[PDB]
Design a protein around this motif. Sequence first.
Motif, short mmCIF file in Angstrom:
data_model
loop_
_atom_site.label_atom_id
_atom_site.label_comp_id
_atom_site.label_asym_id
_atom_site.label_seq_id
_atom_site.Cartn_x
_atom_site.Cartn_y
_atom_site.Cartn_z
N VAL A 85 0.85 -1.19 0.00
CA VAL A 85 0.00 0.00 0.00
C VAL A 85 0.89 1.24 0.00
CG1 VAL A 85 -1.80 1.30 1.23
CG2 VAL A 85 -1.91 -1.20 1.16
N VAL A 86 0.97 1.89 -1.15
CA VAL A 86 1.82 3.06 -1.32
C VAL A 86 0.95 4.30 -1.49
CG1 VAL A 86 3.50 4.21 -2.87
CG2 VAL A 86 3.81 1.80 -2.23
N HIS B 182 2.44 1.77 6.85
CA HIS B 182 3.48 0.75 6.98
C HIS B 182 4.30 0.65 5.70
CE1 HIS B 182 1.16 -0.57 10.48
NE2 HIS B 182 0.10 -0.61 9.70
N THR B 183 5.52 0.15 5.81
CA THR B 183 6.38 -0.06 4.64
C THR B 183 6.24 -1.47 4.07
OG1 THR B 183 8.32 -0.77 5.92
CG2 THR B 183 8.05 1.61 5.56
N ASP C 73 5.91 -2.70 0.22
CA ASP C 73 5.96 -1.51 -0.65
C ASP C 73 7.15 -1.52 -1.61
OD1 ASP C 73 3.69 -0.76 0.73
OD2 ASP C 73 4.66 0.88 1.81
N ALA D 261 5.37 5.61 1.84
CA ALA D 261 4.87 4.31 2.29
C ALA D 261 3.52 4.38 3.00
CB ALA D 261 5.89 3.63 3.19
N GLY D 262 3.23 5.51 3.64
CA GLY D 262 2.01 5.64 4.43
C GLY D 262 2.15 4.97 5.79
CA CA Z 1 2.60 1.13 2.83
#
Ligand code: CA
Length: 351
Positions: A100-101, A153-154, A157, A150-151
């Motif tokens: 999730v980017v 969490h990384t 990604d 990354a938002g």
């Molecule tokens: Ca993320």
Amino acid sequence: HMASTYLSDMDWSSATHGDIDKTKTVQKDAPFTTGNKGEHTKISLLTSDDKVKYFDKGIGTVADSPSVISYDISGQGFEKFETYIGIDQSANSSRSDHAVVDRIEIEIDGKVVYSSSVTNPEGFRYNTQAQFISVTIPQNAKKISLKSFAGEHTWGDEVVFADAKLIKTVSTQTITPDLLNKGINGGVYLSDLEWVDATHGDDDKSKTVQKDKPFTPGNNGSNNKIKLLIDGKEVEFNKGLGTVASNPSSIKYDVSGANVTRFISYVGIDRSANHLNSDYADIQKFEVVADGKVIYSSDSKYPKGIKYDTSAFLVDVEIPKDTQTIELKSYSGKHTWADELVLGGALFMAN
Ligand SMILES: [Ca+2]
């Protein structure tokens, strides 16, 4: 003629990623995680119609807040940056919080030149199809930055900048006496061509405009090279034209049979000329004339003409498309003897 340089073939000024293991590095021509493991897996992205496309070249990272990969492009003359962006097909997408980017940006010298927010406000997921980036690079540009957000969490990604390249037009080097003396690919020296006709200011009409020599020594049987003052320093030219200025004198070329786009020459009075100190200009002006139309005049830069001691000036002018006739016109100062105008390194380009 365009040439591209891949980012993965350049050295980054800095590179950061979102993976907790800092012995790992941002990957060239591979996804971040698989590439760090030593796996031969190529960068791949989902394209239109959900077709998977593989890429030989690119940059593979893990997004952070942000992950930043920067390159020094100072004086490099790049015009465009192009890449495909998305989450690599090799990503761990086993949970919905993985891959999730939030955002991918391209930044040049502190200015955001691309943001994925416009087309992808919710960002990238594992099955988000690739976005193609094509941005113009300012002529003055020094630093380009690849940024990925990354938002929360990384995890998973695996941001890839697939096919990431910098592009420029293949152009001639900065014009110098040295360059005109060595030669330019696609350059044809005027002295290697037949003129239609060439008049001069010398009373002896058995004499002719000289190729690769100043007028008087050339007509006297000497093969002395053309010599000019360049930045207060005497410099010889391997190639060029030697004439005597008149009212005006003119050298005419029929260029109808070719797509001539450019005329390049240093212009001044040959060092071998007779000169005496005078308030009067030795040469009044020099003109490049395309089909009867003046496309260069020396009197913009030198509104009162030039003298023997005047440093030779660079003439570099575009020839208009479909030009039939080019004339080179030399105007005498009329009060002195230093009318031995020479064109150092005079050449045509065809583009
Ligand atoms: Ca993320």
